[PDB]
Design brief:
Chain B: This is NADH dehydrogenase [ubiquinone] 1 alpha subcomplex subunit 13. Chain B: It is found in: Mitochondrion inner membrane. Chain B: Complex I is composed of 45 different subunits. Interacts with CARD15, but not with CARD4. Interacts with STAT3, but not with STAT1, STAT2 and STAT5A. Interacts with OLFM4. Chain B: Belongs to the complex I NDUFA13 subunit family. Chain B: Keywords: Electron transport, Membrane, Mitochondrion, Mitochondrion inner membrane, Respiratory chain, Transmembrane, Transmembrane helix, Transport. This is part of a larger assembly, with chains A and B. Chain A contains two helices and no strands. Chain A is mostly helical. Chain B is an all-alpha fold. The N and C termini of chain B lie far apart (122 Å). Classes of the chains: A mainly alpha, B mainly alpha. Chains A and B meet through helix 1 and helix 2 of A and helix 1 of B.
């Protein structure tokens, strides 16, 4: 029934945010205030496409 | 040939001895106890109201932190 398309391992690499959960919780309110626009763009893409392979950028 | 000496009651008489039932009343009225209980209940209700509303606000704050972190 057709092959499944998958991104290459090179396409999945990105600079990683490597702080623990407590750091994120401490900074969460200001992070949601400051980085709102790209996060909302990503969530809209995610909930409209219904496919994680289309919202990687 | 001295006087007769025998175990006997003392001159005049022995002191009166109690025998009747003695159970004092020793209590508050029912109205006072009911009033104290109802007052305690109302005070507890109001304190719990304040604390539960504060806890609801705290839960909302934590949920908002999770929402911020989700993307």
């Amino acid at each position: 029934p057709g092959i499944v398309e998958l991104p290459t391992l090179e396409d999945l690499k990105v600079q990683e945010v490597k702080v623990s959960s407590s750091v994120l919780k401490a900074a969460a309110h200001h992070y949601g205030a400051q980085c709102d626009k790209p996060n909302k763009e990503f969530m809209l893409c995610r909930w409209e496409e219904k496919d994680p392979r289309r919202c990687l950028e | 040939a001295s006087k007769v000496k025998q175990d006997m009651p003392p001159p005049g008489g022995y002191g009166p001895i109690d025998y009747k039932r003695n159970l004092p009343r020793r209590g508050l009225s029912g109205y006072s106890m009911f009033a104290v209980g109802i007052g305690t209940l109302l005070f507890g209700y109001w304190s719990m109201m304040k604390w539960n509303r504060e806890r609801r606000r705290l839960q909302i704050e934590d949920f908002e932190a999770r929402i911020a972190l989700m993307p």
